[PDB]
Design a protein around this ligand. Structure first.
Ligand SMILES: OCCC(CO)CO
Ligand SMILES: C[As](C)(=O)[O-]
Ligand code: NA
Ligand code: NA
Length: 339
């Protein structure tokens, strides 16, 4: 295993030795993170890890309370709620730390030294293969809008409820902002009487039963994980352009064991951690050198080139999504199109 240790500062490792501890608040399901925890501990067996697996709004609320109340909170925050992470990291909550594992991160995958992408997870199409074969599932917004004119598809579509899901909002908003054809598709959800879900599970359970045949906008990581045990679940990658979310990690400014947090963050971003995350958890890796299905190379091949993937950036530019006029405009269009 030794040749693939993450790059480390000896001073850090010796600090992290003295602390012994590492408080994670994370939106990654433990049973998906476990393999990374276990393998992180094998590299630094002198760090006792508190994985708190929490809802995204729970992490944001909890932290903001503990930090205001002046109490010991997390050492490290890891969340798919990109706008809430970037908000915390651009309001004084983050420890500035230049990760030696992030030297080749694109600028839009890090908030300078304040926060880092750990994943590159595409919004995909999923479909029950018993009801829609691969060859008739469109890979474009314009083709999907056409399929959803069919009376056989009425009531047979799931997508996000952007009014009940923060991640659903982020991904449909990014779609709306980047692809004019999303407006034709949103109208076609109205035509097909799309059902809107606040969770991936709720959606996927209705695709697997066949109560739906097709779900739009859910992430490739959850699909691949569910497909490991449901061979009737198909995945189609959009070839007219794909939006990708990035789980954001940052170190608490006021972390009590900051040096641990550095040794965990560097491990998450390393090829060892990214490899194990892609291979075990089926979470789509950020690092471009990972080999396997849940990886940038595989995504880029599936969509017809890297220039077809729009990564939602680890950038304060995404805080436009929190602007009440900018939400108003998108949600006005959405509710009219889908109802
Ligand atoms: O490109 C680095 C090789 C690793 C990454 O997953 C697999 O053999
Ligand atoms: C945040 As989810 C994977 O339950 O839609
Ligand atoms: Na940057
Ligand atoms: Na879910």
């Amino acid at each position: 295993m030794q040749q693939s240790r993450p790059a480390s500062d000896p001073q850090v490792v010796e600090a992290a030795r003295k602390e012994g501890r590492l408080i994670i608040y994370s939106s990654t399901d433990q049973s998906s993170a476990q393999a990374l925890l276990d393998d992180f501990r094998k590299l630094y067996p002198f760090i006792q890890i508190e994985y708190n697996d929490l809802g995204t709004q729970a992490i944001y609320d909890r932290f903001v309370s503990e930090t205001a109340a002046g109490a010991s909170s997390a050492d490290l925050l890891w969340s798919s709620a990109m706008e809430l992470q970037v908000k915390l990291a651009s309001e004084g909550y983050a420890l500035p730390y230049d990760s030696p594992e992030a030297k080749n991160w694109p600028a839009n995958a890090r908030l300078g030294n304040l926060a880092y992408s750990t994943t590159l997870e595409p919004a995909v199409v999923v479909y029950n293969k018993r009801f829609l074969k691969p060859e008739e599932v469109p890979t474009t917004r314009e083709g999907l809008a056409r399929l959803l004119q069919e009376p056989r598809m009425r009531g047979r579509v799931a997508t996000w409820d952007p009014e009940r899901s923060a991640v659903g909002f982020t991904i449909l908003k990014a779609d709306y902002d980047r692809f004019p054809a999303f407006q034709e598709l949103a109208r076609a959800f109205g035509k097909a009487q799309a059902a809107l879900y606040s969770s991936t599970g709720a959606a996927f359970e209705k695709v697997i039963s066949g109560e739906h045949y097709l779900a739009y906008g859910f992430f490739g990581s959850a699909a691949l994980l569910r497909q490991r045990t449901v061979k009737d679940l198909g995945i189609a990658y959009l070839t007219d352009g794909t939006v990708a979310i990035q789980r954001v990690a940052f170190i608490n400014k006021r972390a009590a064991h900051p040096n641990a947090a550095k040794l965990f963050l560097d491990y998450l971003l390393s090829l060892r951690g990214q490899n194990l995350m892609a291979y075990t958890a089926l979470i789509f890796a950020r690092r471009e050198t990972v080999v396997g299905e849940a990886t940038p190379q595989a995504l880029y091949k599936a969509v017809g080139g890297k220039d077809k993937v729009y990564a939602i950036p680890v950038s304060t530019e995404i805080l436009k999504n929190l602007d009440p006029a900018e939400r108003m405009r998108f949600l006005t269009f959405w509710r009219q199109a889908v109802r």
